[PDB]
């Protein structure tokens, strides 16, 4: 709606131009899961 | 560096013992090590600096501070230590000041430093250079410490400063640099980022310091240096304090309890609370694994009192009853009432299970009572300790300070003792009873008192000096800082938070009226103080909440304001027939602008105020055909005032015919021509006119009045056609005077027509702007062609011609600066449409602008003239 008003003459391009299929999107999922402890965690340390 | 030294000492039997300087360790040996460490290794880490301060320098600074005593002041070792400290250590510490940020983990050390150096600043046998070095080191240190770490130094300064001795020159500056830097820490509710918010005690200390300094400076005799040093400190302290804050030489005087009789009916309560106190003490010990045994042993965890309270003798029970009665006696001496009103609601051996007092809630009143008992415990202990030290020749104690200078944590022990007593009294069914205030309120009332004192003093013609040298800058700074708090309303908040009460608004209005009345017809009597007073009026005029006070308020302030308006009108009428040109006009213009901008017109200018405004309108417009150099010099101020007044007026005085429909007119509760005649005259004078001379009144007065009148009444309608016609006529008038040399008035006119351009119609692009820009481009092209032809010769005669073009460019640099700010606002409203649908006129005007731009870029004289004009005219 406002691409021609500001942006067209400055040389800017739409993000998804010349694409055959819609862009895939990822989202944040709030479901707890078990994961390995990082080797450089700020607070916790695991030793064998 | 960490090796000890042999300081002088007194044998208490004969003379003092003094070391032999030629056969022992000397600080001059440590100075070389300090120099080597500074020059070779340097200091880069905060931890290393903290370690060095811990082991290296602090003991020597403490030794010097201790040796500051009179009996040891002039000894050789004291002088050697002074030289060592002032030549090596303190400069090194000063150079490493920025390393002190974020040292919250070592607070206890830092305070110990800040005290000691401060004491070193007050030595007796020190040269001027050493004192300067110490003061500079302290001032550098205080610039980087967190604000929350300077509380104890502030506590000391609160005691030291308000005496205003010869030693107070340095401390004041320190405070001046503190509150100016950390004003957000004390003012804003959210505080300073990453530094938190202030506490109650700091605000209390700041208020005490401010009032003490003010009261002390009130009575002192005149001294220019003292005033110059003290005024900025007062301004900073006043500006660092919230306006709506409410506040909740140690000689402890606890209440006299020796002759206080406790009623016998409280004996059972005393016994129950004594057993409770024992059980609580025993419980804490037994849970920390302490047990009964003949001896008091810290290692084996044994105490002979870890047994039931029933097993104690009556004399032994006094260990608990004696402190309780003392508490009860204090409560009785204060005439507090204590009356029973309700029912008195596993280790080896002794297991006391006292009731939990954490579930017992104290009201605000009982907590205030606990605070009063706690203060009395502090004063009781304080008086006993002071007497003990005085008798036993002892030193000092950090708790020998007033209770109100202590933090919540330092008060905790005495507070908890008092709270435990009132909770147990409550738990056991006893009813115990004791049987404004804003900073701005007191500030304003003191200002009013001083205002009436100064009015009396001026009527009579030291206090004059204090007035003119203190009160005016303080009012200036304080109200410039805090206008928003006074302008806020409960229904519409403007500032960060809070809003002034109605009484404060009434007080500020009364103060403004009183000052305006005082300054009348006596500008010369104030001499060099005349300008500053005027400034104050402006800052007051920009802070009046006229709507609230006029809607509801005492008759006195309304009468004062009406009298002020009537007096202003009378003065103007007398003038049109020395003081009005200097003081009255700017203040009146500022007041009208404030009223118009904040939209108070419909609520303030009513009844006789409208009559006064009508008189002012007629008197101002009556200038007319009169011609004189004085009028020529005076016209712009009158034009600006008339424009503001026309902006603020609530009745359409230019269209009397519809006056029956106005609900704010006086007639529902005479020589100025009608609007149509004005528009017709402007239209007929725009064509076949083209001379600023022989028509100065229309340009300098009428045009701003119309440009201010039309936009106000367009909103509640007149139509946009009038605005378009006025803009076209203004453009034609401006273009008709391009060749004139002295045309300063144009710089003003383009300012007044700016709000109109928002309502322009598209057709005006084709009819008006294009011919004017074309004429400007043609003139610029001719000028640049002449310049090129002149520069082609490059002979010695070019100096004759260069100035000739140096004039011309300047004239051009004027004309465009009158048109271009008017044009730039136009396109910002229309450009989108031009992008949606192509228009040849926009392309043509772009061509003209590009031609002007390349002409500007080619020549350097153009840039020089433009820069000179911008610098001289002070435009933005």
Q: Which of B205, B195, B207, B208 is nearest to B242 (CA)?
A: B207
SS (HEC) of B285-337:
HHHCCCECCCCCECCCCECCCCCCHHHCCCCCCHHHHHHHHHHHHHHHHCCCE
Closest-CA residue in chain B for A5? B832
Count of alpha carbons within 13 Å of B233, Cβ hemisphere only?
Answer: 25
Question: In whole angstroms, what is the distance from residue B529 CA to residue B540 CA?
Answer: 17
Tracing tokens 């003990």 back to the chain, one arrives at B388
Question: In whole angstroms, what is the distance from residue B813 CA to residue B871 CA?
Answer: 12
Is the CA virtual torsion B578, B584, B590, B593 positive or negative?
negative
Chain A residues touching B830 at Cβ < 8 A: none
Coil, helix or strand at residue B338: strand
Tracing tokens 């007194």 back to the chain, one arrives at B10
What residue spans of B577-674 are helical by DSSP H?
585-598, 601-604, 608-621, 629-648
| Residue B833 C-alpha, separation from nearest chain A C-alpha, in angstroms | 9
Cβ atoms of residues B403 and B248 within 8 Å: no
Question: In whole angstroms, what is the distance from residue B132 CA to residue B686 CA?
Answer: 72
Token pair for B70: 């009179």
SS (HEC) of B121-133:
CCCCCCCHHHHHH
> For chain A, first and last CA: distance in Å?
60
Count of alpha carbons within 13 Å of B618, Cβ hemisphere only?
Answer: 13
Chain A residues touching B835 at Cβ < 8 A: 4-5
As a dihedral over the C-alpha atoms of residue B424, residue B430, residue B433, residue B438, rounded to 10 degrees, the angle is: 50
Closest-CA residue in chain A for B836? A5
Question: In whole angstroms, what is the distance from residue B413 CA to residue B597 CA?
Answer: 57
Beta bridge partners of B302: B291, B297
| Residue B838 C-alpha, separation from nearest chain A C-alpha, in angstroms | 13
Using CA atoms, how far residue A9 sits from A4, A13, B355, B611, B683, in Å, is 8, 10, 81, 59, 42
Token pair for B641: 């005032």
Interface test with A, best of B835, B837, B842 (most A CBs within 10 A): B835
Describe the crossing of helices B224-239 and B169-181 by its angle, rounded to 10 degrees: 30
The DSSP secondary-structure symbol of B75 reads S
Tracing tokens 């005082």 back to the chain, one arrives at B518
Burial of B289 (0-12, 13-18, 19+ CB in 10 A): exposed
| B53-67 exposure pattern, b = at least 16 Cβ within 10 A, e = fewer | beebbeebbebbbeb
Count of alpha carbons within 13 Å of B537, Cβ hemisphere only?
Answer: 23
Token pair for B53: 């301060």
A4 touching B (Cβ < 8 Å): yes
Question: In whole angstroms, what is the distance from residue B786 CA to residue B780 CA?
Answer: 10
As a dihedral over the C-alpha atoms of residue B453, residue B459, residue B461, residue B466, rounded to 10 degrees, the angle is: 20
Q: What are phi and psi of A15, to 5 degrees?
A: -65, -45
Q: Return the number of other C-beta atoms located less than 10 Å from residue B170's C-beta.
A: 17
Q: Which of B200, B194, B195 is nearest to B242 (CA)?
A: B200
The two beta strands, B16-17 and B337-340, are unpaired
Q: Return the number of other C-beta atoms located less than 10 Å from residue B677's C-beta.
A: 11
Token pair for B477: 């700074």
Token pair for B694: 């022989």
The secondary structure element, H or E, covering residue B778 is helix B770-793
Chain A residues touching B832 at Cβ < 8 A: 5
Is the CA virtual torsion B703, B752, B723, B850 positive or negative?
positive
Question: Which region holds residue B353: left if phi is over 0, alpha if psi is between -120 and 50, else beta?
Answer: beta
Tracing tokens 């409550």 back to the chain, one arrives at B426
B833 touching A (Cβ < 8 Å): no
Task: State how far Cα B369 lies from the chain centre.
Answer: 35
Describe the crossing of helices B364-391 and B408-427 by its angle, rounded to 10 degrees: 120
Question: In whole angstroms, what is the distance from residue B300 CA to residue B698 CA?
Answer: 105
Query: What resolution in angstroms does the PDB record give?
Result: 3.4
Question: In whole angstroms, what is the distance from residue B302 CA to residue B160 CA?
Answer: 48
A23 touching B (Cβ < 8 Å): no
SS (HEC) of B210-256:
HHHHHHHHHHCCCCHHHHHHHHHHHHHHHHCCCCCCECCCCCCCCCC
Which residues 6+ apart lie within 8 Å of B319 measured at CB? B305
Q: Which DSSP string do the residues of B346-398 spell out, in sequence order?
A: --SS----PPPSSSPPPPHHHHHHHHHHHHHHHHHHHHHHHHHHHHTT----T
Tracing tokens 């009015």 back to the chain, one arrives at B455
Cβ atoms of residues B310 and B345 within 8 Å: no
Cβ atoms of residues B671 and B617 within 8 Å: no
A5 touching B (Cβ < 8 Å): yes
The secondary structure element, H or E, covering residue B24 is none
Cβ atoms of residues B44 and B95 within 8 Å: no
Cβ atoms of residues B309 and B278 within 8 Å: yes
The DSSP secondary-structure symbol of B674 reads P
Q: Return the number of other C-beta atoms located less than 10 Å from residue B145's C-beta.
A: 17
Which residues 6+ apart lie within 8 Å of B202 measured at CB? B151, B154, B186
Is the CA virtual torsion B365, B437, B208, B389 positive or negative?
negative
Q: Which of B203, B98, B197, B92 is nearest to B145 (CA)?
A: B98
Coil, helix or strand at residue B847: helix
Using CA atoms, how far residue B233 sits from B20, B145, B164, B211, B239, in Å, is 48, 20, 13, 12, 10
Q: To 5 degrees, how large is the angle CA B508–CA B175–CA B103?
A: 125
Which residues 6+ apart lie within 8 Å of B605 measured at CB? B595, B613, B648, B649, B650
Count of alpha carbons within 13 Å of B866, Cβ hemisphere only?
Answer: 10
Question: In whole angstroms, what is the distance from residue B278 CA to residue B352 CA?
Answer: 9
Beta bridge partners of B196: B192
Cβ atoms of residues B56 and B33 within 8 Å: no
Q: Return the number of other C-beta atoms located less than 10 Å from residue B147's C-beta.
A: 20
Token pair for B106: 């070592």
Q: To 5 degrees, how large is the angle CA B131–CA B137–CA B140?
A: 140
Q: Which DSSP string do the residues of B725-770 spell out, in sequence order?
A: HHHHHHHHHHHTTSS-S--THHHHHHHHTGGGGGG--THHIIIIIH
Cβ atoms of residues B496 and B243 within 8 Å: no
Q: Which DSSP string do the residues of B95-151 spell out, in sequence order?
A: HTGGGGTT-GGGHHHHHHHHHHHHHHTT-SS--HHHHHHHHHHHHHHTTTS-GGG-H
B875 touching A (Cβ < 8 Å): no
| Residue B835 C-alpha, separation from nearest chain A C-alpha, in angstroms | 7
Question: In whole angstroms, what is the distance from residue B856 CA to residue B839 CA?
Answer: 26
Which residues 6+ apart lie within 8 Å of B333 measured at CB? B255, B256, B257, B260
B838 touching A (Cβ < 8 Å): no
Q: Return the number of other C-beta atoms located less than 10 Å from residue B756's C-beta.
A: 22
The two beta strands, B16-17 and B9-10, are antiparallel
Q: Which of B168, B182, B241, B249 is nearest to B208 (CA)?
A: B241
Q: Which of B577, B262, B252 is nearest to B401 (CA)?
A: B252
Question: In whole angstroms, what is the distance from residue B532 CA to residue B515 CA?
Answer: 13
Cβ atoms of residues B316 and B258 within 8 Å: no
Which residues 6+ apart lie within 8 Å of B510 measured at CB? B448, B556, B557, B560
Token pair for B567: 């007096």
Which residues 6+ apart lie within 8 Å of B288 measured at CB? B301
Burial of B204 (0-12, 13-18, 19+ CB in 10 A): middle
Q: Which of B161, B272, B139, B145 is nearest to B209 (CA)?
A: B161
The two beta strands, B430-433 and B337-340, are antiparallel
Q: To 5 degrees, how large is the angle CA B214–CA B472–CA B165?
A: 30
Q: Which of B606, B684, B707, B592 is nearest to B651 (CA)?
A: B606
Question: In whole angstroms, what is the distance from residue B454 CA to residue B468 CA?
Answer: 10
Question: In whole angstroms, what is the distance from residue B336 CA to residue B353 CA?
Answer: 31
B21 touching A (Cβ < 8 Å): no
Task: State how far Cα B795 lies from the chain centre.
Answer: 64
Question: Which region holds residue B484: left if phi is over 0, alpha if psi is between -120 and 50, else beta?
Answer: alpha
Q: Return the number of other C-beta atoms located less than 10 Å from residue B850's C-beta.
A: 10
Q: To 5 degrees, how large is the angle CA B543–CA B549–CA B553?
A: 145
Count of alpha carbons within 13 Å of B307, Cβ hemisphere only?
Answer: 12
Cβ atoms of residues B507 and B445 within 8 Å: yes
Q: Which of B643, B672, B559 is nearest to B609 (CA)?
A: B559
Q: Which DSSP string do the residues of B462-510 spell out, in sequence order?
A: -HHHHIIIIIHHHHHHHHHHHHHHHH-BTTB--SSS----HHHHHHHHH
Question: In whole angstroms, what is the distance from residue B45 CA to residue B28 CA?
Answer: 26
Question: In whole angstroms, what is the distance from residue B486 CA to residue B495 CA?
Answer: 9
Q: Which DSSP string do the residues of B521-569 spell out, in sequence order?
A: T-TGGGGGGHHHHHHHHHHHHTT--HHHHHHS--HHHHHHHHHHHHHHH
Coil, helix or strand at residue B78: helix
Closest-CA residue in chain A for B832? A5
Question: In whole angstroms, what is the distance from residue B248 CA to residue B207 CA?
Answer: 12
Token pair for B160: 């030291």
Chain B residues touching A5 at Cβ < 8 A: 832, 835-836
B832 touching A (Cβ < 8 Å): yes
Burial of B18 (0-12, 13-18, 19+ CB in 10 A): middle
Task: State how far Cα B64 lies from the chain centre.
Answer: 40
Interface test with B, best of A2, A5, A7, A9 (most B CBs within 10 A): A5
Coil, helix or strand at residue B796: coil
Q: Which of B91, B74, B103, B78 is nearest to B37 (CA)?
A: B91
Closest-CA residue in chain A for B834? A5
Question: In whole angstroms, what is the distance from residue A35 CA to residue B296 CA?
Answer: 56
Q: Which of B590, B495, B496 is nearest to B534 (CA)?
A: B590
Token pair for B150: 């300077």
Q: Which DSSP string do the residues of A1-48 spell out, in sequence order?
A: --TTTTTTTTT---TTTT-SSPPP-----------PPPTT-SS-----
Question: In whole angstroms, what is the distance from residue B735 CA to residue B729 CA?
Answer: 10
> Rg for chain A (alpha carbons), in Å?
22
A1 touching B (Cβ < 8 Å): no
Using CA atoms, how far residue B542 sits from B4, B406, B533, in Å, is 65, 42, 15
> For chain B, first and last CA: distance in Å?
61
The DSSP secondary-structure symbol of B68 reads T
Q: Return the number of other C-beta atoms located less than 10 Å from residue B866's C-beta.
A: 17
Q: Which of B362, B329, B374, B330 is nearest to B430 (CA)?
A: B362
Coil, helix or strand at residue B192: strand
β strands within B376-452, DSSP E: 430-433
């Amino acid at each position: 709606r406002f691409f021609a008003i500001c942006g067209l003459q400055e040389g800017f391009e739409p993000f998804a131009i010349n694409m055959q299929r819609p862009v895939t999107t990822w989202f944040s999922k709030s479901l707890p899961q078990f994961e390995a402890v990082p080797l450089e965690h700020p607070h916790y340390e695991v030793s064998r | 560096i960490s090796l000890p030294l042999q300081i002088p000492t007194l044998g208490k039997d004969g003379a003092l013992v003094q070391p032999k300087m030629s056969a022992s360790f000397v600080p001059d040996h440590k100075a070389s090590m300090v120099l080597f460490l500074d020059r070779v290794y340097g200091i880069e880490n905060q931890d290393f600096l903290l370690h060095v301060l811990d082991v290296g320098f602090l003991p020597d600074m403490r030794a010097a501070a201790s040796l500051d005593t009179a009996t040891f002041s002039t000894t050789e070792m004291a002088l050697a230590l002074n030289r060592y400290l002032c030549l090596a250590v303190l400069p090194l510490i000063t150079k490493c000041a920025p390393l002190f940020a974020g040292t919250e983990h070592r607070a206890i050390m830092v305070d110990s430093m800040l005290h000691t150096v401060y004491r070193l600043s007050r030595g007796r046998s020190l040269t001027k250079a050493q004192r300067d070095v110490i003061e500079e080191c302290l001032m550098a240190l205080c610039r980087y410490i967190r604000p929350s770490m300077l509380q104890h130094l502030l506590r000391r300064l609160v005691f030291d400063v308000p005496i205003l001795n010869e030693f107070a020159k340095m401390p004041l500056k320190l405070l001046t640099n503190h509150y100016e830097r950390c004003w957000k820490y004390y003012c804003l509710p959210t505080g300073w980022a990453n530094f938190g918010v202030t506490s109650e005690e700091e605000l209390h200390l700041t208020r005490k310091l401010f009032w003490g300094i003010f009261d002390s400076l009130a009575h002192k005799k005149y001294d220019p240096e003292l005033y110059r040093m003290a005024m900025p400190c007062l301004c900073a302290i006043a500006g660092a304090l919230p306006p709506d804050y409410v506040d909740a030489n140690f000689d402890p005087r606890p209440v006299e309890t020796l002759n206080v009789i406790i009623p016998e009916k409280l004996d059972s309560f005393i016994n129950k609370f004594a057993e409770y106190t024992h059980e609580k003490w025993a419980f804490d010990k037994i849970q920390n694994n302490w047990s009964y045994g003949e001896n008091i042993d810290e290692e084996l965890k044994t105490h002979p009192m870890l047994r039931p309270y029933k097993t104690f003798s009556e004399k032994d029970k006094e260990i608990y009853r004696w402190p309780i009665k003392e508490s009860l006696k204090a409560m009785i001496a204060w005439e507090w009432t204590i009356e029973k009103a309700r029912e008195g609601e596993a280790r080896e051996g002794y297991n006391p299970q006292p009731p939990d007092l954490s579930g017992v809630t104290l009201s605000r009143e009982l907590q205030a009572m606990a605070e009063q008992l706690a203060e009395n415990y502090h004063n009781t202990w304080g008086r006993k300790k002071k007497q003990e030290l005085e008798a036993k020749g002892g030193g000092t104690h950090p708790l020998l300070v007033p209770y109100d200078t202590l933090t919540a944590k330092e008060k905790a022990r005495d507070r908890e003792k008092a709270q435990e007593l009132l909770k147990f009294l409550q738990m056991n069914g006893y009813a115990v009873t004791r049987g404004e205030k804003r900073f701005a309120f007191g500030f304003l009332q003191q200002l009013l008192r001083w205002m009436d004192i100064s009015q009396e003093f001026i009527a009579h013609l030291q206090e004059i000096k204090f007035f003119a040298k203190i009160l005016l800058p303080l009012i200036n700074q304080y109200f410039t800082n805090h206008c928003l708090y006074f302008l806020s309303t409960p229904a519409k908040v403007l500032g960060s938070g809070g809003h002034a009460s109605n009484k404060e608004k009434e007080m500020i209005t009364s103060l403004f009226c009183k000052l305006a009345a005082l300054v009348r017809h006596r500008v010369s009597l104030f001499g060099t103080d005349a300008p500053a007073v005027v400034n104050c009026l402006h800052i007051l005029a920009r802070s009046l909440d006229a709507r609230t006070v006029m809607k509801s308020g005492p008759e006195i302030v309304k009468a004062g304001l009406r009298s002020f308006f009537e007096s202003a009108s009378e003065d103007i009428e007398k003038m049109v027939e020395t003081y009005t040109t200097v003081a009255l006009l700017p203040v009146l213009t500022t007041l009208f602008q404030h009223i118009a901008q904040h939209q108070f017109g419909d609520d303030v200018i009513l009844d006789d105020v409208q009559v006064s405004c009508y008189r002012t309108l007629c008197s101002i417009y009556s200038l007319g055909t009169t011609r004189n150099p004085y009028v020529e010099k005076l016209r712009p101020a009158l034009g600006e005032c008339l424009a503001r007044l026309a902006a603020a007026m609530p009745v359409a005085f230019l269209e009397p015919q519809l006056n029956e429909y106005n609900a704010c007119s006086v007639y529902t509760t005479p020589d100025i021509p009608v609007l149509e005649r004005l528009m017709a005259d402007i239209g007929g004078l725009a064509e076949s006119g083209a001379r600023y001379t022989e028509m100065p009144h229309v340009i300098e007065i009428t045009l701003p009045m119309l440009c201010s009148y039309l936009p106000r009444w367009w909103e509640r309608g007149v139509t946009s056609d009038h605005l378009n016609s006025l803009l076209g006529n203004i453009l034609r008038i401006i273009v008709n005077n391009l060749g004139i040399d002295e045309a300063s008035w144009m710089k003003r006119l383009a300012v007044f027509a700016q709000p109109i351009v928002s309502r322009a119609r598209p057709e005006l692009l084709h009819s008006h702007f294009i011919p004017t820009i074309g004429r400007l481009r043609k003139r610029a092209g001719k000028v640049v062609a002449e310049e090129e032809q002149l520069r082609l010769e490059a002979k010695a005669e070019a100096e004759e011609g260069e100035l000739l073009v140096r004039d011309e460019f300047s004239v051009l640099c004027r004309d465009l600066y009158a048109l271009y700010p008017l044009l730039i606002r136009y396109v910002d409203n229309n450009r989108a449409h031009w992008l949606t649908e192509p228009n040849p006129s926009a392309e043509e005007l772009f061509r003209m602008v590009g031609e002007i731009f390349i002409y500007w870029s080619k020549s350097h004289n153009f840039k020089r003239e433009e820069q000179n004009f911008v610098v001289q005219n002070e435009i933005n």
